[PDB]
Design a protein around this ligand. Structure first.
Ligand SMILES: Cc1cc2nc3c(=O)[nH]c(=O)nc-3n(C[C@H](O)[C@H](O)[C@H](O)COP(=O)(O)O)c2cc1C
Ligand SMILES: Cc1cc(Nc2ccc(S(F)(F)(F)(F)F)cc2)n2ccnc2n1
Ligand SMILES: O=C(O)c1cc(=O)[nH]c(=O)[nH]1
Length: 324
Protein backbone atom coordinates (compact mmCIF):
# COMPACT_ATOMS: atom_id res chain seq x y z
CA UNK A 1 0.00 0.00 0.00
CA UNK A 2 2.58 2.60 1.06
CA UNK A 3 4.49 2.69 -2.22
CA UNK A 4 1.43 2.71 -4.48
CA UNK A 5 -0.10 5.57 -2.48
CA UNK A 6 3.12 7.62 -2.65
CA UNK A 7 3.86 6.77 -6.28
CA UNK A 8 2.11 9.74 -7.98
CA UNK A 9 4.11 12.17 -5.82
CA UNK A 10 7.34 10.21 -6.35
CA UNK A 11 6.78 10.03 -10.11
CA UNK A 12 6.74 13.87 -10.15
CA UNK A 13 10.42 13.76 -9.11
CA UNK A 14 13.39 13.01 -11.29
CA UNK A 15 13.85 9.22 -11.51
CA UNK A 16 17.12 8.76 -9.65
CA UNK A 17 16.01 11.14 -6.89
CA UNK A 18 12.75 9.20 -6.57
CA UNK A 19 14.67 5.93 -6.57
CA UNK A 20 16.92 6.96 -3.69
CA UNK A 21 14.03 8.55 -1.77
CA UNK A 22 11.99 5.38 -2.11
CA UNK A 23 14.82 3.21 -0.77
CA UNK A 24 15.38 5.64 2.12
CA UNK A 25 11.69 5.58 3.02
CA UNK A 26 11.63 1.77 2.74
CA UNK A 27 14.51 1.58 5.23
CA UNK A 28 12.75 3.87 7.70
CA UNK A 29 9.37 2.19 7.34
CA UNK A 30 11.08 -1.15 7.98
CA UNK A 31 12.73 0.18 11.16
CA UNK A 32 9.31 1.47 12.24
CA UNK A 33 7.84 -2.04 11.95
CA UNK A 34 6.09 -1.38 8.64
CA UNK A 35 6.41 -2.73 5.08
CA UNK A 36 6.34 -6.40 6.15
CA UNK A 37 4.75 -8.56 3.43
CA UNK A 38 3.58 -12.13 3.86
CA UNK A 39 4.29 -14.33 0.81
CA UNK A 40 3.33 -17.96 0.16
CA UNK A 41 5.78 -20.79 0.77
CA UNK A 42 7.01 -22.32 -2.50
CA UNK A 43 10.17 -24.25 -1.58
CA UNK A 44 12.47 -24.66 -4.58
CA UNK A 45 15.81 -26.47 -4.52
CA UNK A 46 18.31 -25.16 -7.07
CA UNK A 47 22.13 -25.18 -7.23
CA UNK A 48 22.12 -27.09 -3.96
CA UNK A 49 20.36 -24.17 -2.24
CA UNK A 50 16.94 -24.43 -0.58
CA UNK A 51 15.02 -21.33 -1.72
CA UNK A 52 11.89 -20.59 0.35
CA UNK A 53 10.25 -19.31 -2.82
CA UNK A 54 11.58 -18.86 -6.37
CA UNK A 55 11.26 -15.06 -6.64
CA UNK A 56 14.40 -13.02 -6.23
CA UNK A 57 15.50 -9.42 -6.29
CA UNK A 58 17.67 -8.77 -9.33
CA UNK A 59 20.99 -7.04 -9.04
CA UNK A 60 21.25 -3.27 -9.34
CA UNK A 61 18.55 -2.10 -6.93
CA UNK A 62 20.68 -2.53 -3.80
CA UNK A 63 24.11 -2.10 -5.35
CA UNK A 64 25.89 -1.79 -1.96
CA UNK A 65 23.88 -4.18 0.20
CA UNK A 66 22.68 -1.21 2.25
CA UNK A 67 18.96 -2.09 2.18
CA UNK A 68 18.98 -5.86 2.68
CA UNK A 69 16.76 -6.17 5.75
CA UNK A 70 14.11 -3.79 4.44
CA UNK A 71 14.03 -5.52 1.04
CA UNK A 72 13.94 -8.95 2.67
CA UNK A 73 10.83 -7.84 4.54
CA UNK A 74 9.07 -7.73 1.18
CA UNK A 75 9.20 -11.54 1.08
CA UNK A 76 11.75 -12.31 -1.66
CA UNK A 77 12.97 -15.90 -1.66
CA UNK A 78 16.44 -14.52 -2.40
CA UNK A 79 18.15 -11.15 -2.76
CA UNK A 80 20.97 -10.28 -5.19
CA UNK A 81 23.12 -7.29 -4.26
CA UNK A 82 25.65 -5.50 -6.44
CA UNK A 83 27.11 -5.13 -8.92
CA UNK A 84 29.99 -4.32 -6.60
CA UNK A 85 33.57 -3.52 -7.66
CA UNK A 86 36.86 -3.71 -5.75
CA UNK A 87 36.98 0.06 -5.14
CA UNK A 88 34.18 2.65 -4.96
CA UNK A 89 33.34 4.51 -8.13
CA UNK A 90 30.86 7.27 -9.04
CA UNK A 91 29.30 5.76 -12.17
CA UNK A 92 28.27 7.87 -15.16
CA UNK A 93 27.28 11.55 -15.07
CA UNK A 94 23.71 12.44 -14.27
CA UNK A 95 21.09 12.28 -15.60
CA UNK A 96 21.49 8.53 -16.06
CA UNK A 97 18.12 6.96 -15.15
CA UNK A 98 14.97 7.54 -17.19
CA UNK A 99 11.36 6.47 -16.66
CA UNK A 100 9.18 5.75 -19.70
CA UNK A 101 5.84 5.26 -17.98
CA UNK A 102 3.56 4.77 -20.99
CA UNK A 103 5.60 1.67 -21.86
CA UNK A 104 6.19 0.60 -18.21
CA UNK A 105 9.88 0.86 -19.08
CA UNK A 106 13.15 2.19 -17.70
CA UNK A 107 16.42 3.14 -19.43
CA UNK A 108 19.57 3.31 -17.34
CA UNK A 109 23.21 4.08 -17.84
CA UNK A 110 24.16 4.07 -14.17
CA UNK A 111 27.73 3.02 -14.90
CA UNK A 112 28.24 0.64 -11.96
CA UNK A 113 28.06 3.28 -9.25
CA UNK A 114 28.93 1.57 -5.97
CA UNK A 115 30.71 1.97 -2.63
CA UNK A 116 33.23 -0.84 -3.18
CA UNK A 117 33.45 -4.39 -1.91
CA UNK A 118 34.80 -3.61 1.57
CA UNK A 119 31.78 -1.39 2.34
CA UNK A 120 29.36 -3.94 0.91
CA UNK A 121 30.85 -6.57 3.24
CA UNK A 122 30.53 -4.26 6.24
CA UNK A 123 26.91 -3.64 5.25
CA UNK A 124 26.24 -7.39 4.96
CA UNK A 125 27.87 -8.08 8.35
CA UNK A 126 25.65 -5.45 9.99
CA UNK A 127 22.43 -6.76 8.43
CA UNK A 128 20.22 -9.23 10.27
CA UNK A 129 19.20 -11.13 7.11
CA UNK A 130 20.37 -14.74 7.12
CA UNK A 131 18.58 -15.99 4.00
CA UNK A 132 19.76 -16.50 0.43
CA UNK A 133 22.08 -13.65 -0.57
CA UNK A 134 23.50 -13.45 -4.09
CA UNK A 135 26.46 -11.13 -4.62
CA UNK A 136 27.08 -9.78 -8.13
CA UNK A 137 30.75 -8.89 -8.69
CA UNK A 138 32.43 -6.75 -11.28
CA UNK A 139 35.44 -4.67 -12.32
CA UNK A 140 36.28 -1.05 -11.77
CA UNK A 141 36.00 1.22 -14.79
CA UNK A 142 39.55 2.52 -14.26
CA UNK A 143 41.19 -0.94 -14.26
CA UNK A 144 43.36 -1.66 -17.33
CA UNK A 145 41.90 -4.29 -19.66
CA UNK A 146 44.83 -6.65 -19.06
CA UNK A 147 44.18 -6.51 -15.28
CA UNK A 148 40.39 -6.85 -15.39
CA UNK A 149 40.38 -10.53 -14.41
CA UNK A 150 42.09 -9.64 -11.15
CA UNK A 151 39.28 -7.27 -10.15
CA UNK A 152 36.81 -10.15 -10.34
CA UNK A 153 39.24 -12.27 -8.33
CA UNK A 154 39.52 -9.64 -5.57
CA UNK A 155 35.77 -9.47 -5.25
CA UNK A 156 35.39 -13.25 -5.42
CA UNK A 157 37.81 -13.80 -2.53
CA UNK A 158 36.41 -10.95 -0.45
CA UNK A 159 32.74 -11.99 -0.72
CA UNK A 160 33.14 -15.80 -0.80
CA UNK A 161 32.47 -16.38 2.91
CA UNK A 162 29.39 -14.04 2.85
CA UNK A 163 27.55 -15.07 -0.32
CA UNK A 164 25.01 -17.81 -0.90
CA UNK A 165 25.91 -17.61 -4.62
CA UNK A 166 28.00 -15.22 -6.73
CA UNK A 167 26.99 -13.70 -10.08
CA UNK A 168 29.37 -12.52 -12.81
CA UNK A 169 27.95 -10.63 -15.77
CA UNK A 170 29.44 -11.49 -19.13
CA UNK A 171 29.75 -9.49 -22.34
CA UNK A 172 28.71 -10.74 -25.78
CA UNK A 173 35.64 -11.52 -27.11
CA UNK A 174 35.14 -15.26 -26.89
CA UNK A 175 38.76 -15.69 -25.82
CA UNK A 176 38.23 -13.18 -23.02
CA UNK A 177 35.19 -15.02 -21.67
CA UNK A 178 36.99 -18.37 -21.68
CA UNK A 179 40.04 -16.94 -19.89
CA UNK A 180 37.89 -15.23 -17.26
CA UNK A 181 35.87 -18.38 -16.54
CA UNK A 182 38.97 -20.58 -16.34
CA UNK A 183 40.52 -18.24 -13.77
CA UNK A 184 37.35 -17.63 -11.72
CA UNK A 185 36.35 -21.30 -11.66
CA UNK A 186 39.82 -22.40 -10.56
CA UNK A 187 39.83 -19.78 -7.80
CA UNK A 188 36.30 -20.65 -6.67
CA UNK A 189 37.39 -24.27 -6.22
CA UNK A 190 40.40 -23.16 -4.14
CA UNK A 191 38.22 -20.96 -1.92
CA UNK A 192 35.70 -23.78 -1.44
CA UNK A 193 38.51 -25.87 0.04
CA UNK A 194 39.87 -23.05 2.18
CA UNK A 195 36.42 -22.18 3.60
CA UNK A 196 35.02 -25.73 3.69
CA UNK A 197 31.92 -24.90 1.67
CA UNK A 198 30.81 -24.52 -1.93
CA UNK A 199 29.40 -21.18 -3.15
CA UNK A 200 27.75 -21.55 -6.60
CA UNK A 201 28.92 -19.38 -9.49
CA UNK A 202 26.23 -17.93 -11.77
CA UNK A 203 26.77 -16.08 -15.04
CA UNK A 204 24.41 -13.36 -16.32
CA UNK A 205 23.94 -12.43 -19.98
CA UNK A 206 22.28 -9.67 -21.96
CA UNK A 207 19.45 -10.57 -24.37
CA UNK A 208 21.11 -9.13 -27.48
CA UNK A 209 22.68 -12.40 -28.59
CA UNK A 210 22.94 -14.26 -31.88
CA UNK A 211 22.25 -17.99 -32.19
CA UNK A 212 26.02 -18.47 -32.45
CA UNK A 213 26.44 -16.46 -29.23
CA UNK A 214 23.95 -18.67 -27.37
CA UNK A 215 25.68 -21.83 -28.62
CA UNK A 216 29.12 -20.54 -27.61
CA UNK A 217 28.00 -19.38 -24.16
CA UNK A 218 26.15 -22.66 -23.57
CA UNK A 219 29.32 -24.61 -24.39
CA UNK A 220 31.32 -22.48 -21.93
CA UNK A 221 28.77 -22.95 -19.14
CA UNK A 222 29.00 -26.71 -19.57
CA UNK A 223 32.77 -26.89 -20.02
CA UNK A 224 33.42 -24.89 -16.83
CA UNK A 225 30.56 -26.48 -14.86
CA UNK A 226 28.93 -23.14 -14.11
CA UNK A 227 26.12 -23.56 -11.58
CA UNK A 228 23.41 -21.32 -13.08
CA UNK A 229 22.59 -18.76 -15.75
CA UNK A 230 20.61 -15.51 -15.35
CA UNK A 231 18.74 -14.56 -18.55
CA UNK A 232 18.76 -11.60 -18.88
CA UNK A 233 20.24 -8.15 -18.22
CA UNK A 234 18.89 -5.03 -20.01
CA UNK A 235 18.67 -4.60 -23.79
CA UNK A 236 20.29 -2.15 -26.18
CA UNK A 237 17.08 -2.28 -28.23
CA UNK A 238 14.63 0.62 -28.18
CA UNK A 239 11.73 -1.36 -29.62
CA UNK A 240 8.60 -0.26 -27.76
CA UNK A 241 9.84 3.19 -26.70
CA UNK A 242 10.90 4.89 -29.96
CA UNK A 243 7.95 7.31 -29.87
CA UNK A 244 8.00 8.19 -26.18
CA UNK A 245 10.07 10.70 -24.20
CA UNK A 246 13.53 9.41 -23.23
CA UNK A 247 13.15 6.54 -25.72
CA UNK A 248 16.38 7.53 -27.49
CA UNK A 249 18.53 7.75 -24.35
CA UNK A 250 21.65 5.62 -24.35
CA UNK A 251 21.85 2.72 -21.92
CA UNK A 252 19.96 -0.46 -21.11
CA UNK A 253 16.18 -0.80 -21.46
CA UNK A 254 14.19 -2.77 -18.86
CA UNK A 255 10.58 -3.26 -17.87
CA UNK A 256 7.80 -4.31 -20.20
CA UNK A 257 9.62 -3.81 -23.54
CA UNK A 258 12.32 -6.35 -22.58
CA UNK A 259 9.89 -9.12 -21.58
CA UNK A 260 9.60 -10.80 -25.00
CA UNK A 261 13.31 -10.61 -25.92
CA UNK A 262 14.54 -11.77 -22.50
CA UNK A 263 11.99 -14.60 -22.41
CA UNK A 264 12.95 -15.78 -25.91
CA UNK A 265 16.62 -15.72 -24.90
CA UNK A 266 15.67 -17.89 -21.92
CA UNK A 267 13.85 -20.26 -24.29
CA UNK A 268 16.91 -20.57 -26.55
CA UNK A 269 19.27 -21.34 -23.66
CA UNK A 270 16.74 -23.81 -22.22
CA UNK A 271 16.70 -25.69 -25.52
CA UNK A 272 20.50 -25.79 -25.69
CA UNK A 273 21.23 -26.67 -22.05
CA UNK A 274 18.58 -29.44 -21.88
CA UNK A 275 18.12 -29.26 -18.12
CA UNK A 276 21.82 -29.40 -17.24
CA UNK A 277 22.19 -25.86 -15.84
CA UNK A 278 19.44 -24.07 -13.86
CA UNK A 279 18.06 -20.92 -15.49
CA UNK A 280 17.00 -17.77 -13.63
CA UNK A 281 14.48 -15.77 -15.70
CA UNK A 282 14.70 -11.97 -15.52
CA UNK A 283 13.34 -9.16 -17.69
CA UNK A 284 10.03 -7.35 -17.88
CA UNK A 285 8.22 -9.15 -15.08
CA UNK A 286 5.41 -6.68 -14.25
CA UNK A 287 2.79 -9.22 -13.10
CA UNK A 288 2.68 -12.73 -11.72
CA UNK A 289 1.60 -14.03 -15.12
CA UNK A 290 4.98 -13.02 -16.53
CA UNK A 291 6.83 -14.88 -13.77
CA UNK A 292 4.86 -18.01 -14.61
CA UNK A 293 5.71 -17.49 -18.28
CA UNK A 294 9.44 -17.52 -17.47
CA UNK A 295 8.97 -20.81 -15.60
CA UNK A 296 7.11 -22.30 -18.58
CA UNK A 297 9.96 -21.16 -20.86
CA UNK A 298 12.45 -23.11 -18.73
CA UNK A 299 13.34 -21.01 -15.67
CA UNK A 300 13.58 -22.54 -12.20
CA UNK A 301 13.88 -19.15 -10.46
CA UNK A 302 13.02 -15.58 -11.48
CA UNK A 303 14.20 -12.14 -10.45
CA UNK A 304 12.36 -8.82 -10.53
CA UNK A 305 13.44 -5.16 -10.57
CA UNK A 306 11.66 -2.72 -12.91
CA UNK A 307 8.23 -4.12 -12.02
CA UNK A 308 8.74 -2.86 -8.50
CA UNK A 309 8.81 0.68 -9.88
CA UNK A 310 5.44 0.31 -11.58
CA UNK A 311 3.51 -2.47 -9.86
CA UNK A 312 5.27 -1.97 -6.55
CA UNK A 313 6.25 -4.28 -3.72
CA UNK A 314 3.13 -6.46 -3.95
CA UNK A 315 4.65 -7.84 -7.17
CA UNK A 316 6.71 -10.23 -4.97
CA UNK A 317 3.53 -11.79 -3.57
CA UNK A 318 1.89 -11.92 -6.98
CA UNK A 319 4.81 -13.74 -8.59
CA UNK A 320 5.02 -16.42 -5.94
CA UNK A 321 1.25 -17.02 -6.14
CA UNK A 322 1.34 -17.33 -9.93
CA UNK A 323 4.29 -19.70 -10.31
CA UNK A 324 3.50 -23.43 -10.36
C1 LIG B 1 18.59 1.15 -12.68
C2 LIG B 1 19.01 -0.26 -12.99
C3 LIG B 1 20.28 -0.66 -12.52
C4 LIG B 1 20.72 -1.93 -12.76
N1 LIG B 1 22.03 -2.30 -12.27
C5 LIG B 1 22.41 -3.62 -12.45
C6 LIG B 1 23.65 -4.09 -11.85
O1 LIG B 1 24.29 -3.37 -11.10
N2 LIG B 1 23.95 -5.36 -12.12
C7 LIG B 1 23.27 -6.24 -12.86
O2 LIG B 1 23.63 -7.39 -13.08
N3 LIG B 1 22.05 -5.86 -13.42
C8 LIG B 1 21.69 -4.55 -13.18
N4 LIG B 1 20.43 -4.16 -13.75
C9 LIG B 1 19.70 -5.17 -14.55
C10 LIG B 1 18.58 -5.86 -13.80
O3 LIG B 1 19.18 -6.76 -12.81
C11 LIG B 1 17.79 -6.75 -14.74
O4 LIG B 1 18.59 -7.78 -15.31
C12 LIG B 1 17.07 -5.94 -15.88
O5 LIG B 1 16.70 -4.69 -15.36
C13 LIG B 1 15.88 -6.72 -16.46
O6 LIG B 1 14.87 -6.99 -15.49
P1 LIG B 1 13.58 -6.02 -15.31
O7 LIG B 1 13.01 -5.69 -16.68
O8 LIG B 1 12.62 -6.83 -14.46
O9 LIG B 1 14.02 -4.85 -14.56
C14 LIG B 1 19.98 -2.86 -13.49
C15 LIG B 1 18.70 -2.49 -13.94
C16 LIG B 1 18.27 -1.22 -13.70
C17 LIG B 1 16.88 -0.84 -14.21
C1 LIG C 1 9.00 6.33 -7.64
C2 LIG C 1 10.23 5.67 -8.27
C3 LIG C 1 10.88 4.62 -7.62
C4 LIG C 1 11.97 4.05 -8.23
N1 LIG C 1 12.72 2.99 -7.67
C5 LIG C 1 12.21 2.11 -6.66
C6 LIG C 1 13.08 1.67 -5.64
C7 LIG C 1 12.61 0.82 -4.66
C8 LIG C 1 11.31 0.35 -4.68
S1 LIG C 1 10.76 -0.71 -3.38
F1 LIG C 1 9.42 0.17 -3.18
F2 LIG C 1 12.04 -1.61 -3.54
F3 LIG C 1 10.24 -1.65 -2.24
F4 LIG C 1 11.49 0.13 -2.35
F5 LIG C 1 10.04 -1.60 -4.35
C9 LIG C 1 10.42 0.79 -5.66
C10 LIG C 1 10.89 1.66 -6.67
N2 LIG C 1 12.38 4.52 -9.43
C11 LIG C 1 13.39 4.14 -10.29
C12 LIG C 1 13.33 4.94 -11.40
N3 LIG C 1 12.30 5.80 -11.28
C13 LIG C 1 11.68 5.52 -10.06
N4 LIG C 1 10.62 6.12 -9.48
O1 LIG D 1 25.26 0.02 -13.47
C1 LIG D 1 24.75 -0.12 -14.55
O2 LIG D 1 24.78 0.83 -15.49
C2 LIG D 1 24.12 -1.37 -15.04
C3 LIG D 1 24.66 -2.59 -14.78
C4 LIG D 1 24.10 -3.75 -15.37
O3 LIG D 1 24.56 -4.87 -15.27
N1 LIG D 1 22.93 -3.56 -16.10
C5 LIG D 1 22.36 -2.33 -16.35
O4 LIG D 1 21.35 -2.23 -17.02
N2 LIG D 1 22.98 -1.25 -15.80
Amino acid sequence: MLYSLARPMLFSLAPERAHELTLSMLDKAHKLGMMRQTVEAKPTTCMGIEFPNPVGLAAGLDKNGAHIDALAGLGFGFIEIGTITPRPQSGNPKPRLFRIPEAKAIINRMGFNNDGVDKLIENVKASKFRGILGINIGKNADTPVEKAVDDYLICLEKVYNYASYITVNISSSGDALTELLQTLKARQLELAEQYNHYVPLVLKVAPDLTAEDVEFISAQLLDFKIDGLIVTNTTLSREGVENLPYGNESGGLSGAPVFEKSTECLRLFAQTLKGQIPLIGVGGILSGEQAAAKQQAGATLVQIYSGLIYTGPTLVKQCVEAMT
